[PDB]
Scaffold this active site. Structure first.
Site, PDB file in Angstrom:
ATOM      1  CG  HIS A 155      -2.125  -0.834   1.091  1.00  9.00           C
ATOM      2  ND1 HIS A 155      -2.079  -2.114   0.582  1.00  9.00           N
ATOM      3  CD2 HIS A 155      -3.412  -0.622   1.457  1.00  9.00           C
ATOM      4  CE1 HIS A 155      -3.284  -2.655   0.643  1.00  9.00           C
ATOM      5  NE2 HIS A 155      -4.111  -1.772   1.171  1.00  9.00           N
ATOM      6  CG  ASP A 209      -2.214  -1.291  -9.356  1.00  7.79           C
ATOM      7  OD1 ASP A 209      -1.959  -0.247  -8.735  1.00  7.79           O
ATOM      8  OD2 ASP A 209      -3.314  -1.863  -9.267  1.00  7.79           O
ATOM      9  CB  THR A 255     -14.461  -6.563  -1.973  1.00  5.42           C
ATOM     10  OG1 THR A 255     -14.250  -7.002  -0.627  1.00  5.42           O
ATOM     11  CG2 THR A 255     -15.910  -6.670  -2.324  1.00  5.42           C
ATOM     12  CG  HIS A 291      -7.446  -3.714  -6.490  1.00  5.56           C
ATOM     13  ND1 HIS A 291      -8.345  -2.736  -6.832  1.00  5.56           N
ATOM     14  CD2 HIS A 291      -6.270  -3.080  -6.301  1.00  5.56           C
ATOM     15  CE1 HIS A 291      -7.725  -1.577  -6.854  1.00  5.56           C
ATOM     16  NE2 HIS A 291      -6.465  -1.767  -6.534  1.00  5.56           N
ATOM     17  N   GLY A 292     -10.440  -5.861  -7.497  1.00  4.98           N
ATOM     18  CA  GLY A 292     -11.737  -5.418  -7.697  1.00  4.98           C
ATOM     19  C   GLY A 292     -11.571  -3.981  -8.068  1.00  4.98           C
TER      20      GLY A 292
HETATM   21  N1  LIG Z   1     -12.123  -3.711  -4.824  1.00  4.98           N
HETATM   22  C1  LIG Z   1     -11.282  -3.287  -3.901  1.00  4.98           C
HETATM   23  N2  LIG Z   1     -11.285  -3.852  -2.670  1.00  4.98           N
HETATM   24  C2  LIG Z   1     -10.424  -3.414  -1.743  1.00  4.98           C
HETATM   25  N3  LIG Z   1      -9.512  -2.423  -1.880  1.00  4.98           N
HETATM   26  C3  LIG Z   1      -9.568  -1.828  -3.165  1.00  4.98           C
HETATM   27  C4  LIG Z   1     -10.400  -2.181  -4.169  1.00  4.98           C
HETATM   28  N4  LIG Z   1     -10.173  -1.420  -5.275  1.00  4.98           N
HETATM   29  C5  LIG Z   1      -9.159  -0.573  -4.903  1.00  4.98           C
HETATM   30  N5  LIG Z   1      -8.724  -0.862  -3.564  1.00  4.98           N
HETATM   31  C6  LIG Z   1      -7.652  -0.354  -2.537  1.00  4.98           C
HETATM   32  C7  LIG Z   1      -6.159   0.161  -2.830  1.00  4.98           C
HETATM   33  O1  LIG Z   1      -5.751   0.204  -4.306  1.00  4.98           O
HETATM   34  C8  LIG Z   1      -4.285   0.263  -4.580  1.00  4.98           C
HETATM   35  P1  LIG Z   1      -3.171   1.395  -4.351  1.00  4.98           P
HETATM   36  O2  LIG Z   1      -1.926   0.803  -4.871  1.00  4.98           O
HETATM   37  O3  LIG Z   1      -3.211   1.870  -2.944  1.00  4.98           O
HETATM   38  O4  LIG Z   1      -3.525   2.557  -5.390  1.00  4.98           O
HETATM   39  P2  LIG Z   1      -2.897   3.945  -5.793  1.00  4.98           P
HETATM   40  O5  LIG Z   1      -2.795   4.776  -4.549  1.00  4.98           O
HETATM   41  O6  LIG Z   1      -3.527   4.540  -6.975  1.00  4.98           O
HETATM   42  O7  LIG Z   1      -1.395   3.427  -6.198  1.00  4.98           O
HETATM   43  P3  LIG Z   1       0.020   4.174  -6.386  1.00  4.98           P
HETATM   44  O8  LIG Z   1       0.314   4.722  -5.062  1.00  4.98           O
HETATM   45  O9  LIG Z   1       0.830   3.038  -6.772  1.00  4.98           O
HETATM   46  O10 LIG Z   1      -0.132   5.208  -7.442  1.00  4.98           O
HETATM   47 YB   LIG Z   2      -3.861  -1.198  -6.886  1.00  7.66          YB
END
Ligand SMILES: Nc1ncnc2c1ncn2CCOCP(=O)(O)OP(=O)(O)OP(=O)(O)O
Ligand SMILES: [Yb+3]
Ligand SMILES: Nc1ncnc2c1ncn2CCOCP(=O)(O)OP(=O)(O)OP(=O)(O)O
Ligand SMILES: Nc1ncnc2c1ncn2CCOCP(=O)(O)OP(=O)(O)OP(=O)(O)O
Ligand SMILES: [Ca+2]
Ligand SMILES: [Ca+2]
Ligand SMILES: [Ca+2]
Ligand SMILES: [Ca+2]
Ligand SMILES: [Ca+2]
Ligand SMILES: [Ca+2]
Ligand SMILES: [Yb+3]
Ligand SMILES: [Yb+3]
Lengths: 484, 143, 503, 143, 470, 143
Positions: free
Chosen positions: C60, C200, C257, C286-287
């Site tokens: 995360h 991603d 989820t 992920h979802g």
């Molecule tokens: N369906 C789901 N269920 C649970 N958590 C989800 C769902 N869809 C999205 N998430 C939660 C976190 O998604 C990933 P994350 O890597 O934290 O994104 P981001 O903040 O855009 O990435 P980056 O920091 O790599 O740019």
């Molecule tokens: Yb992600």
């Protein structure tokens, strides 16, 4: 002589709407009771006067004191007075989000519209300036400036809605960045219509005359005490009668925690300003500050209106303390100070100090068993019984059948008794580093108390000559003669 | 609160030659008294009989913790009193004097004589210092 | 008409690797389903394309969008995009520390090495510049600059490892200061070797065609429901399949989820990019965001690929809402919006608003006996709990007028028994039932001010009941016809006058 | 959850001329019905007999709180339904129309006639407004 | 690459006399003494006999402005100046020290003695500026290159006051006029005396001999005089009297010997003229498991009496390795290292040889009729093994490993195995491979696995392998 | 202690052809042994008889979770040992060698012969690698 502002000059700094303050003199006088208000957002004053509604306990967002939204309650708390304080902003918003959800239809948010006159008001106060024009999607806007460096504001010519965006490369406290968007403000529901809110009058404290409190006591419930042969069980019911009708307070639904006389006084206040024309509703919405125990605010300037009807403005906390001491808590007026003072307020961890006479004395006063135990509790955050017992012997209401001369004696002894059952604990093992200190403390106290009772009539001097060794009504015989 | 239970715990284990943690009603009183209370022998029975149906006379914490969880209800006014004390003490010396007791009284209607006044002080006074300290003011308002 | 970017220009802002997007058109079309992606770290794109692995839910930490570590996941989150945001940095690091420990051997961290080509890429994007040389313990280094003011970066000539240190007198957000030291980056274990991670493709939402959902339903089970008498239970049958097969979702082990069709669609997507050469593994992990209920992210620009295969990029949230409304939720396509919207997301306390028709109409709709008894509970949060009966101070009174009738009378309004009467009948019986409740309510307020907020609840119901009734009436022919009606004597009689009144 | 139990608590104390908090099975039904349910007389027995072995017919909260703690299991789909409603309502007017009901259906295979369609709407319709509001859509999905 | 003598002592922060005085103890007791940095602006105060802060005071000292060297109540005046969260966490700590320890700790106005101002002028911290008169009272401005606050000192009592500059705002978003600068103080004989940074000890590594001296001659004998457990009788007399640590309140978690070592250090300083009691109030950082501080420069005094100052954490690690943990000296490193410290979530890494050679295997599930689940398969380290000969063992061992090589392990396609488990078993396999070649090379895994076919009870292939010893 | 209980849970369900979660004493040993313990048949009885008064010989988790809640008391020294291991290992190679075992010993008084030393290593050695790894050092210190 203390350095406090008076009249006009003070009212100026109080933030209250002049008419409202004047109107208040009436109640302060009539009811012979000091009225103390916490600062009021100066940029809120005019809004109030123009009849804008004030925020009740169902709205904890902080008002703003800068920019176009000055005087109102911005939904985006980084636009409030707490601007630039990440934690405060965040705590502020959660509060608004809560207000919006846990009170649906009751409270809501709406776009801020700056009326033709308001812009003017703001120009004078030197808060914002109507600048160059701008056209964006076939829509006419007029920039509104402010010496602020993070945001940029503009107002719509059509509906007069104000919008704001973050400056180039600049970042919000919460680490945000966005373009043009409306400035929403907290509002309450009034007759199906959503009307904007503004700062209210927060009462710092209400100090009524003891007599005024008397009027609160029912004429025969008091007589059933006044008229009582006994004296002890009287002085009690007379006190308990002060408490019930004067001191005790309770959590009302929306008025927060206040007392009953306070509830009345509250209404008189809102009444007063409505006679002057305030059409917004209440200007005072809840209990007072001395009961705001979870998140105490420590303001520098307090605005006081004495039963004379005069205006005083304490300059600083230390001063506000004096004023209250010299003219209220020391002049037959009912007063109690926030229970959180001298403690760490639970909510915001505030640590506001205040002068508490009872403590002052602690040094010269031996403790009760309870305190003694409860001192062993709060000393367990990281063991023997004759001591707490003896202390229970020192404070025995049975003594109310003996003579002072007797009392001092029996007490002086009981103290020396405990000072022994303690001295031997330390003579015993170190036990805990801090427990040692607790006893070196008790010792001193017990010492002072005794030594005090004695100079009342005639410590260690008379400590070398006394028994330890064989325990009943005998070791007490020598003492009798020793004191003479 | 944590301290609340923490307090009841301190005294409880103060006297208990039982070990594990089970005292008798022959001392239950002493406990409640050392912890700042003056219960009557009549009240020390109708309670130790309602919850204690053991018929053994053995008492522990969870049981005691519940009894206190009832008495400490319309008495926890500790605050109100302490505040009231501060109201009488005009000179802020930490003690309540006769002169002071006078005002509060006279200002509440009941005009007392220098005699009656000095009587109340002396009655409430427990150490004979000629004044009432909070601790005393407390007993006088409770016991 | 909406101000949204299209094609090339939009793809440019989407952040997805061109080839990958093009490859996606295929699936969008073939499966007649809208595909919506949340922004993608632009400085991540190239890394992705070059086959770098992307971060799954076990990571995360936020990616970085500046400096030499741009595009990767710096262990020191103050080197990420959240740079300079104390709480975010801190929350970010804890997350990394957790990734490193609660997933040993699965995830780890490694020194960042900037390949000869990457430096070049960075130079174009204008992120860093290879500067003067430096020699430090018999070792050759080359400074790497950035318009940043807190840190200073340099790269090793030998192994190409990048190191950084805090500038003179400057202090880290977390109040740190240190000299040259390697820049570690989050990595995953691949065949015993630790390979670096990058952003991603986060799916904002997947909107399939109702038909496409049909293919999910077993043709037989659709029969055991489409083959039956009961005209009413006819719909209820499909409604529950529509759900079971397209609306319901469940917490998968590592895919978070998502639903089952989504699981498939997911695989097609990863498949598609592997067909193009992506050797990093999955690009979608992920979802969709609509199920990310605990920590919802509210992005400004959404990248949409319609079943046509075109590229659209909403400019702002308000816009993304319109797009979805006009072309999806209003055009026979399956769609559900994050259940946290219009509520305070538990995780990050976010409060993202979204248009919910149900509410946009609960103004002209009468409350359910339940959608009432429940309110009385919530509104019971501004008082103390005790006994509903006998709530007055006086001992001569023990009951709030019309205690339960208001509820029952609401349960009467919504009675399935009405399915044997005529609309003309229905409106009548209902219009009345409403007026009935509006009475058992009006008298409660006519009785005592009970609780300040309880008063409002009724001034509210009133209005609603009002609108609903007044609505049914303009359907055929409020207070106007309220002055002429009975209160005083209660069975099948007060209902007689009404009958004639409406005509 | 807190509200969950809080809800079951609201209705429970709504009707109870008992006082302390103990109702009868002669009303248990009315309760579950006012709280948004339509149980059959057959189900109101096999449950009030399993947990209620008192043979007195007296019911309180802790007991009731447990019964609900079972029924509300494979029915708490409140969500899924609400979402589905939103799926039918293409025009986002907050109501489900025949035209709308048509599409969803035809797009799912079942091609219906302007007659059959209008039949389903009326059947599901409870107020006669000629359309289905969420509340109605709900009843129709959980009767 | 470490500093030595004078130069190092200079950076250590300790009062020279005190350090010199320490050589004595380091030497005499043949034990390394390591100190964490000491607020340089605190040094002189310490030397002049000011008291140091114990565990009942967690506010951070200040290293700038008039209050430099002391513990300002208003932690935004401390070294953490400008760090909202730190300031806030700092204050709460002071508030607590003030309340949860009444009469023990308190705060008092800061008074800058005539000499101190001078000291500060040299260090270039503040400058006595123009005069000012405010209510018939004489003040003298005190400057500092700081931009948020403004300081002045009273001519009468020498109390320092400060206020926020014009339009400027405190980190906590405050603003106020002239007011006294309060400082944490402890109660000494009824009088409240100001506090200053103490001598936070990093670590203590005694000559292994010394811990022996600690053992009672008796308890030692009952196991050393051929009572051969012995083999384990020593380690335990090494643990209880050398490694074992336990809480203590005034001091924190530490060890008996450490406690003593404390006393000598303290006493050792009095002799130089230190009035204000103790300078070393508690156990070493290596036992500070909840809120570990990772400092860059460690000050070490070796049993020789020399002064060394590691330049950076990585270096401090080497030093300890090469000259202590690898040279017969007792040493243990903070148990929080390589983990997420609970208190501040710190993640300080340290070299753990045990994890070094972690290419081995044991009770995993550390990883978290018809006999198939039972059987002795996960017990490579069969205690009953001293009966076999070194050859048998290494020979049998490989077998046991391989036993696990294809155990229930080849279940690589049980339904849907996550890359998490495979990775493990894989790794495990990568371990069993090396955890063999060694046993081999001692006396000669990808050697011969074709000469192995496990398709029956391990007992049947047992004979096979023994024949494969060729 | 989450992991603690979590650990005892892993093994417990590892072998249990019972299903619901109830094993026998015929295997209780194997469990405690697979979980890193070497109990004697004498100790596997006086305990499975104190808490297990069922007389059925059936054991579950809550029961087992309590037994472990006692043994793991004056043995949880896992730490102290691990540290001690690191003390012997001067070269920090992760293994304890004879040369190393010598020093520690000689420096503690007991001067050993190259023979006696090599004897201890081999005794403690379990794999025959000619050195003691932590795992081994552990077993050797367990009993
Ligand atoms: N369906 C789901 N269920 C649970 N958590 C989800 C769902 N869809 C999205 N998430 C939660 C976190 O998604 C990933 P994350 O890597 O934290 O994104 P981001 O903040 O855009 O990435 P980056 O920091 O790599 O740019
Ligand atoms: Yb992600
Ligand atoms: N009796 C009480 N009960 C509950 N909260 C109280 C009470 N008295 C005071 N408070 C706390 C806060 O009073 C309202 P609040 O909105 O926080 O005021 P404010 O901060 O002065 O408003 P402003 O932000 O609009 O300037
Ligand atoms: N053995 C121990 N037990 C508990 N806490 C410890 C132990 N050893 C060290 N600590 C934690 C903190 O030591 C005191 P602290 O006042 O925080 O030092 P410091 O940070 O160097 O002070 P300074 O801010 O005055 O420079
Ligand atoms: Ca007095
Ligand atoms: Ca007295
Ligand atoms: Ca519709
Ligand atoms: Ca309808
Ligand atoms: Ca070794
Ligand atoms: Ca070995
Ligand atoms: Yb207020
Ligand atoms: Yb310290």
């Amino acid at each position: 002589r203390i350095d406090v502002l008076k009249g006009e000059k003070a009212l100026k700094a109080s933030g209250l709407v002049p008419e409202h303050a004047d109107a208040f003199k009436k109640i302060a006088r009539e009811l012979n009771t000091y009225i103390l208000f916490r600062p009021v957002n100066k940029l809120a004053t005019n809004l109030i006067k123009s009849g804008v509604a004030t925020k009740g306990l169902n709205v904890h967002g902080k008002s703003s004191d800068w920019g176009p939204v000055a005087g109102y309650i911005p939904f985006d708390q980084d636009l409030s007075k707490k601007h630039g304080q990440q934690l405060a902003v965040e705590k502020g918003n959660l509060e608004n989000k809560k207000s919006i959800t846990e009170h649906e239809g009751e409270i809501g948010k709406i776009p801020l519209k700056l009326d033709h006159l308001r812009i003017e008001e703001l120009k004078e106060n030197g808060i914002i300036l109507k600048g160059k024009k701008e056209i964006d999607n076939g829509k006419k806007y007029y920039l509104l400036e402010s010496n602020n460096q993070v945001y940029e504001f503009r107002i719509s010519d059509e509906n007069n809605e104000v919008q704001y965006k973050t400056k180039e490369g600049k970042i919000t406290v919460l680490g945000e960045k966005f373009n043009w968007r409306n400035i929403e403000v907290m509002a309450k529901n009034v007759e199906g219509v959503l009307k904007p809110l503004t700062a209210d009058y927060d009462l710092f404290a209400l100090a009524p005359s003891l007599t005024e409190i008397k009027k609160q006591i029912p004429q025969k419930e008091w007589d059933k005490v006044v008229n009582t042969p006994n004296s002890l069980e009287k002085q009690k019911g007379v006190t308990n009668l002060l408490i019930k009708y004067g001191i005790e307070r309770k959590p009302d639904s929306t008025k927060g925690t206040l007392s009953n006389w306070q509830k009345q006084m509250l209404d008189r206040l809102n009444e007063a300003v409505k006679y002057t024309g305030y059409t917004g509703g209440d200007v005072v919405n809840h209990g007072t500050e001395q009961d705001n125990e979870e998140f105490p605010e420590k303001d520098n300037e307090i605005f006081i209106i004495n039963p004379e009807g005069e205006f005083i403005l304490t300059k600083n906390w230390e001063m506000t303390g004096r004023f209250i001491e010299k003219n209220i808590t020391g002049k037959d007026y009912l007063y109690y100070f926030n229970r959180s003072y001298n403690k760490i307020a639970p909510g915001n961890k505030a640590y506001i100090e205040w002068t508490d006479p009872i403590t002052k004395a602690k040094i010269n006063t031996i403790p009760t068993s309870a305190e003694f135990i409860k001192n062993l509790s709060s000393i367990r955050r990281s063991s023997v019984k004759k001591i707490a017992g003896y202390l229970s012997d020192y404070y025995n209401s049975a003594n109310h059948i003996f003579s002072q001369e007797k009392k001092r004696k029996i007490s002086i002894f009981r103290g020396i008794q405990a000072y022994n059952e303690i001295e031997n604990v330390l003579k015993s093992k170190q036990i805990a580093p801090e427990y040692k200190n607790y006893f070196q403390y008790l010792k001193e106290r017990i010492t002072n108390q005794v030594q005090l009772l004695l100079t009342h009539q005639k410590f260690k001097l008379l400590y070398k000559q006394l028994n330890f060794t064989e325990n009943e009504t005998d070791n007490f015989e020598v003492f009798q003669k020793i004191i003479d | 609160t944590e301290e609340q239970i923490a307090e009841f715990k301190e005294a409880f284990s103060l006297f208990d030659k039982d070990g594990d943690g089970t005292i008798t009603t022959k001392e239950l009183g002493t406990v409640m008294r050392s912890l700042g209370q003056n219960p009557t022998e009549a009240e020390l029975q109708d309670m130790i009989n309602e919850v204690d149906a053991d018929g053994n006379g053995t008492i522990d914490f969870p049981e005691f913790l519940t009894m206190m969880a009832r008495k400490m209800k319309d008495t926890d006014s500790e605050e109100e009193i302490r505040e009231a004390f501060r109201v009488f003490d005009k000179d802020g010396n930490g003690y309540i004097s006769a002169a002071e007791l006078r005002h509060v009284m006279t200002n509440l209607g009941e005009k007392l004589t220098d005699e009656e006044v000095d009587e109340m002080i002396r009655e409430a006074d427990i150490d004979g210092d000629g004044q009432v300290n909070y601790e005393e003011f407390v007993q006088m308002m409770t016991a």
